[PDB]
């Protein structure tokens, strides 16, 4: 919901960063404004054919050759704009990590428990690729559209005075034929949905007793609900499809109603020699163009808003400065410490809940060498004074002194180094197990090491290492016990020769050899170190010259080891899919072959009319070259017509589609809904021996794989139709008059597409390489997020920062080479359209030069072909799903 401005998208732009988006912003203005010269060069040619059609080899070769520089112009812009605005966006995701790090580590304990780690880690993850994603990708194309359009405004003001206005009128046309479309969809949609809810429910009420209602006495019964119920909803849903086609029908009628007005108004002006056909063609199109460009916007805007949220995020929880400063040289720095530490009336209360007045009030000493436990109910805050001698907390009052010094006046790393404390359950970073004895200190030789080991016994795990400590520890860190890992954990803190020590619930949650051990060994450290420990063991209470009564997060007591023995102590699918094909779903539905029939028929109606729009569009450009006048506007008017024919053909065809496929599919859904129930409800008691046939997962099923099937049964047979039309009517158009123009084209455009729109994020399967590896790069970031306690009992922020830049080192070069070929893919693409059109073109030329074809012939193929390549345009996937379900679940028994 929140958002930043959006300067604020780009608030860690260096000098370099601020160059880099300055020229990517050039060259996407420069994209935009190539466009619509693309499409007035066009509309030149156009106007250079007509009059030859009546001399172009010099005219010919110049716009040929204006052609290509276009084309290299777009290359060149494309590659630039795409490579400069994913290396910012790169190099600001650097920056945005590395700061969001180095403030969530400069961040208390207090402010990570109000942010649980999973929503910091999803943070750090899925926003910080949004962010990366929206930039890069989004604000150039978002900035090319936007100059498109104006550029478009811009030709279509200066070309024509009044020829946008009857654009600027069918607008409100489909304002308000999004009315007409808005009403019925509308109320009738609501109705469709609201008439599903009888089978969902009368469903779900039996898949949910399942005989035991004694049910099989019910079989008739819902056997009757179906009889009823589900032919009450096809009727329901017959009706939803023809409502939503009829919308898209009527659509395609206004529009298609709207260009014929748009071109008879553009004779009127031709005849009426104020404007030239070229001219009425190039502003159309230039119009339409701007008009499809915000279109194509809509997912970047939505894209830039969602990145703009995560941004707002992001940049709010690296601008919280911190109730620390665990850096900067603030506070004493004694260099020599008694090691005496004393809290005198302390007060604090939890940042997220300050209901908890735990710490009360503390009045506790510790002298130099003063071994003093801590002993307590359990969960009576007594981690709570760990936390405070930790500096997690800030007293808002109170004195914590250490040897006459207030904590709060001391540098907090000056502090730490000489203060360490084990986890509760120190979890082995990941890393080996030298690695993680040695994060007591940066360096430290190995006599320190073998001393730790020698002091926690640990040799008694050592002997089995492949290379003892420069063993890996194992996969996750969970192959090694606890108390392993405990003695491990208490020589990393070892090593760090700490003056004071804290230990939190150290000695629980292990084997007895394994407790004994590690008591033994924390009483072999306990000599020359002041410890105040937190746990539950006996011995460690016992052994101890002074304790302290912790109950209720406040000292009650104090002193000799009789007097606190008094004070009441604790005593006192296609792999797991047989073969299974379509021609199953159609056999399925052998008693609906005349309905599958008209469907088809239906079909390959609308598949013939796609490419008629082709020679209609060919006709009407080419027929202002004839000499008369009196005919121009009677074909012109002819053709107005024609258009608006094939706008109530679309009409008509697109209503019969949706009934015949309507009644199909939903027939097919009521005979799948019967067959599967009788399936499931005439077997034996037995068939809930696999639990993932819940009566949740069976109404899930029912409810969506019956639409999707009916999805799959039609519209797969009709989008086949549609391609297989199209695609042989371009064929055969061509070949009626061409035997090589149609060679070409057939060759430069699919080889366009498999170098074109596939490749974008799809080949060199490095580009999947690289997302596989950002997505495994978070493992660092969520070990540190969650082990931040231990983090900061050693202080490893700095050392994890090096690791994680590191590990984000070779990401970085993933990136740049994954920015960098995608940019070149894209480029292609977006050039291989210039470029065939210069071909083609050409070509044509060369073929009328000579005496081939005729411009009413090159026209009409590289029209016809060009729209049917684009005319071309996932739920096969859930189709196989749901058809194999079914299948698989009522054909058996």
Request: glycine share 8%.
């Amino acid at each position: 919901l929140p958002m930043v401005g959006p300067l604020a998208l780009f608030r860690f732009a260096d000098g370099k960063d601020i160059v880099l988006i300055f020229m990517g912003t050039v060259m996407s203005v420069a994209h935009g404004a190539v466009l619509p010269l693309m499409c007035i060069v066009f509309g030149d040619m156009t106007d250079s054919f007509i009059k030859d059609s009546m001399t172009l080899q010099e005219d010919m070769q110049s716009f040929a050759i204006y052609y290509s520089i276009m084309g290299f112009v777009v290359l060149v812009a494309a590659y630039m704009q795409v490579s400069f605005w994913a290396l910012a966006a790169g190099r600001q995701v650097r920056r945005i990590r590395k700061l969001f790090f180095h403030r969530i580590m400069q961040q208390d304990i207090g402010w990570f428990d109000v942010n649980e780690t999973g929503e910091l880690n999803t943070r750090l993850t899925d926003d910080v690729y949004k962010i990366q994603e929206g930039i890069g990708d989004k604000v150039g194309m978002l900035i090319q559209a936007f100059s498109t359009f104006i550029t478009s405004f811009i030709i279509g003001f200066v070309k024509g005075w009044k020829l946008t206005l009857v654009i600027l009128a069918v607008s409100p046309a489909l304002g308000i034929s999004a009315a007409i479309f808005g009403k019925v969809l509308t109320n009738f949609t609501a109705k469709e949905q609201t008439a599903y809810a009888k089978a969902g429910a009368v469903a779900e009420e039996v898949l949910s007793a399942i005989r035991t209602v004694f049910a099989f006495s019910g079989q008739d019964r819902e056997i009757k609900r179906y009889h009823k119920n589900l032919e009450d909803a096809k009727n329901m849903g017959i009706k939803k499809a023809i409502s939503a086609n009829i919308a898209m029908g009527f659509t395609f009628l206004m529009i298609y109603l709207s260009y014929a007005l748009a071109f008879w108004y553009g004779s009127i002006l031709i005849m009426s020699k104020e404007y030239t056909i070229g001219t009425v063609l190039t502003v159309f199109f230039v119009v339409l163009i701007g008009a499809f460009t915000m279109g194509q916007t809509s997912p970047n805007i939505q894209s830039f808003a969602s990145a703009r949220g995560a941004a707002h995020k992001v940049y709010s929880i690296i601008d919280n400065q911190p109730c620390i400063d665990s850096y900067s040289d603030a506070g004493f720095k004694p260099d020599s410490i008694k090691g005496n530490i004393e809290f005198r009336n302390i007060h604090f209360n939890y940042p997220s809940r300050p209901d908890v007045k735990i710490l009360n009030n503390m009045s506790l000493s510790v002298k130099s060498g003063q071994t003093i436990a801590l002993v307590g109910s359990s969960g009576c805050g007594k981690s709570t004074t760990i936390q405070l001698l930790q500096r997690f907390y800030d007293p808002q009052e109170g004195s914590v002194s250490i040897d006459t010094h207030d904590i709060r006046s001391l540098n907090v790393r000056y502090l730490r180094e000489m203060i360490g404390v084990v986890s509760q359950e120190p979890i082995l970073f990941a890393t080996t197990i030298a690695e993680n004895i040695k994060y007591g200190r940066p360096d430290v030789t190995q006599q320190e090491i073998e001393q730790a080991a020698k002091e926690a016994n640990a040799y008694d795990f050592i002997m089995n290492l492949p290379d003892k400590f420069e063993t890996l520890v194992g996969d996750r860190g969970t192959q090694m016990s606890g108390g392993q890992k405990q003695r491990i954990a208490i020589a990393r803190a070892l090593v760090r020769n700490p003056k004071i020590l804290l230990l939190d619930e150290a000695t629980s949650a292990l084997d007895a050899e394994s407790e004994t051990i590690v008591q033994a060994a924390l009483d072999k450290v306990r000599l020359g170190r002041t410890t105040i420990v937190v746990a539950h063991r006996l011995s460690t209470i016992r052994n101890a010259d002074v304790i302290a009564g912790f109950h209720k997060g406040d000292v009650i007591e104090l002193g000799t080891h009789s007097q606190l023995m008094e004070k009441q102590g604790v005593y006192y699918e296609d792999e797991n899919v047989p073969p299974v094909s379509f021609l199953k779903v159609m056999r399925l539905n052998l008693s609906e072959w005349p309905y599958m029939a008209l469907g088809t028929f239906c079909a390959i109606i609308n598949g013939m009319m796609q490419p008629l729009f082709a020679v209609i569009f060919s006709k009407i450009i080419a027929v202002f070259a004839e000499p008369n006048q009196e005919i121009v506007r009677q074909k012109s008017e002819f053709f107005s017509l024609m258009f608006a024919a094939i706008g109530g053909v679309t009409f008509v065809t697109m209503f019969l589609q949706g009934f015949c496929f309507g009644k199909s599919g939903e027939l097919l859904t009521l005979k799948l809904r019967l067959g599967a129930f009788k399936s499931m409800m005439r077997q034996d008691l037995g068939w809930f021996d696999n639990p993932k046939n819940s009566v949740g997962a069976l109404t899930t099923r029912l409810a969506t794989d019956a639409a999707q099937v009916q999805g799959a049964t039609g519209v797969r047979m009709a989008t086949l139709a549609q391609n297989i039309a199209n695609l042989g009517t371009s064929i055969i158009i061509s070949f009626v008059y061409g035997w090589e123009l149609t060679l070409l084209i057939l060759s430069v455009v699919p080889i366009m597409a498999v170098a074109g729109s596939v490749q974008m994020q799809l080949l060199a399967g490095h580009a999947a390489e690289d997302k596989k590896e950002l997505e495994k790069a978070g493992k660092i970031a969520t070990e540190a997020i969650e082990n931040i306690r231990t983090v900061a009992s050693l202080t490893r922020e700095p050392k994890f920062e090096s690791l994680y830049q590191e590990n984000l080192h070779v990401p970085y070069k993933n990136s740049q080479k994954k920015a960098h070929v995608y940019g070149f893919t894209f480029s292609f693409s977006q050039a291989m359209i210039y470029f065939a059109y210069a071909g083609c073109f050409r070509f044509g030329a060369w073929l009328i030069k000579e005496g081939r074809m005729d411009a009413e012939g090159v026209y009409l193929v590289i029209s016809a072909v060009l729209f049917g390549a684009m005319a071309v345009g996932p739920n096969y996937a859930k189709a196989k799903m749901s058809a194999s379900h079914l299948m698989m679940l009522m054909n058996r028994e």
